[PDB]
Amino acid sequence: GKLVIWINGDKGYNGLAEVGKKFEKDTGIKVTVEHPDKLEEKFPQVAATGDGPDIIFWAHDRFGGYAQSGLLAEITPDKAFQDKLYPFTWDAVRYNGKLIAYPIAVEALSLIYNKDLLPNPPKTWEEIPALDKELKAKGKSALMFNLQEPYFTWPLIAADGGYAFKYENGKYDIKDVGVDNAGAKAGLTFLVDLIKNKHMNADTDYSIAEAAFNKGETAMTINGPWAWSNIDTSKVNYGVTVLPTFKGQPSKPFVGVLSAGIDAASPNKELAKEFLENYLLTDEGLEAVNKDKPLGAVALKSYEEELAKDPRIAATMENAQKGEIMPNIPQMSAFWYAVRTAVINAASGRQTVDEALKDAQTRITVSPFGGLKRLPAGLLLGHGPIRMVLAILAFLRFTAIKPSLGLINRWGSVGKKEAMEIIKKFKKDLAAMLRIINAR
């Protein structure tokens, strides 16, 4: 028995490793926490393969897609444990009447400002152009945040009416997509204008923004509670407040519930549930993670009634209420990827705001059709890379269809040692398919 944990690199993974080493002292079970990049994308590729984690930590929005593929184990908490966490966090990890993860903490973006460079932060977005010009004369800048991840750009886009999927009477409408309406265009136009008027740089990312704010070079940034730890060390005199309003409407950040899912085929399910229920989601467990990087508003009632007395957590909750909970439907991946493309292309000038958001809408409504419209041209006649050629040969053998002579000539000419190892990998792929189903 052993536990392998995956968590994002901006969260307190060292603190989590301490509760894991607490677990090991008590149980003798090894616990390993890793922070791979794009782990939310890697998980469906490694689930049920033995190459993945027993426990995956990410915002709740990605877990519905995992569940629809049958990759997440359904959790079975006791009523007593169920009541230890806030009902709002349990709903974030519910998908088709089943719980598919343990909710950990509520995270929401907030405005972080340098009190020495700006004692009175702007209440509206429109104050920032005039405010940037004034600080630029003093060798500073008004605002810097990560423009290349749509999580950070969305609060302004949704402010005046942008939305992902329309939500009417308890269900999401996967075909009513609102990334291309008037309010979305209004917010994204304003953001591009800031870049054209040299108030922001379109290439700015997370590290540049956070380094700039912690170096006292920018007055404001937009970030979540995890950022507070490094501002503390940097001794920047900072505050956390509500995001500026746009066209009088408040900014509407997408609210994330950090959640821990278990691989449906993991041999260590009961060890995973025990670690999550009895070690991490306790006062001491979450305090260990919180000390490394702040979790935000935790789902555990006892600890959150103490956390709620910090004005930074109060600001997070207030920004969180102005926003909305992220959907957990599988189409969210298409939503994020399309919106990431649109905001970067508009900010860099490769498309207009109207061209960028329309394409973003077409991706979303067309993505449920899958990554493949039709086998690559000439594949069933033997044209293509050998790995894809062996895949289609395996397919035709599975279906008892006689392959073309072009395929058979490719089948005869491929190297013995290379074709064998490729086809052994195919067997490892089917081995995973078997485990996913047997875990149902």
Add this chain to the structure above:
Amino acid sequence: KIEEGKLVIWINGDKGYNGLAEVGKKFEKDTGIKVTVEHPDKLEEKFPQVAATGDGPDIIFWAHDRFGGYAQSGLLAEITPDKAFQDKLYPFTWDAVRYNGKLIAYPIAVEALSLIYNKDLLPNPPKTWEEIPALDKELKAKGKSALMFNLQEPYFTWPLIAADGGYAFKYENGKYDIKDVGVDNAGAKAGLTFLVDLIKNKHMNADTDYSIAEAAFNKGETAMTINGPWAWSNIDTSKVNYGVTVLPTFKGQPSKPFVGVLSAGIDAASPNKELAKEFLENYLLTDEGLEAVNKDKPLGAVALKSYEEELAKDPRIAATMENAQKGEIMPNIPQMSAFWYAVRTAVINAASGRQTVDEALKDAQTRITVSPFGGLKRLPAGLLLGHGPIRMVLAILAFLRFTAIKPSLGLINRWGSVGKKEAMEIIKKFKKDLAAMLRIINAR
């Protein structure tokens, strides 16, 4: 079924498999390796489905025409006889088992169809096909029939089709041209029209098969039949006093039967290849081995020089050799599989009346020239969205996993709605299909 330390042999049911079983018993006594002879139906079709799976034979006995297709898929082991053994067999039978400069089987016997006639009912067999309609009416007046043979396999219908120029693939400069198919020329139309006229004019019945034809001749109900040397054994016991001669001519041109060289191939993935080579070279392809098979059912003109020089003094073997020269050796190229399947449909449909002779052979010709492109033009409509039989959708899901391609939402929920183990056993067959692919690849 395939196991190490034993040999499993597949041979057609009309051949002398009991005689072959006796040489296998002799092999077992000498070596301790048990030999098991089986005669499943459609074994020439079943072998490619079971090759390299352990459910097939170590040795397959069939005419050479099917072995080139087996070789193109890498299912046949390459043969490595010494030059000394090579000269024990006639050089031309080795040509029947040569494919892409490699030998892929052992030649056993040369088989050719011949005209078998009841000497008591007809002392002077016809020289031309056109004599038989007039010959039938006279025997029908006595309650008999002139000719009945297996119409359901084109092997028997082909000698009359090829007489006036029907051919499989043209032969240019020692090579076979896959794109010049001669199933639709005037002579092909001419020969099959004659055969349909016989059925219209109630000289033959389109439903006649091997079992019906052979029963009547052995019961003295028909004067003539068309069959190969394997058939002589049942006519001997029946005490019908018969003869074996040349097939009648049609439009002055001789009948050109496709000649088959009965051959033994070895599975490219067999653990008993050395045992197979040793059994084939040292026990069966000997005077004693082939005589044991020939006593059960006649092999025809064997490829082994020493034994055939005794066989050739039999007039029936002379007639078999004679018809063999009037015909041509079959190509062993993979498209022969398409050719035979195609002219089987054409001859059955024209004989049963479902199409005209000219349309039947034209469509027969198109299938032959289209077979290189494979059995699939494109995936069934809606397959990538989850619509289709359960096995093919899970196959395409496996394919998208192999290639790291995101599946559609229709595919994902079909994946969610499938029976838990109905999918698990479908996927285990997938696990073993790849296991077979691996053995085929590693067998080179």
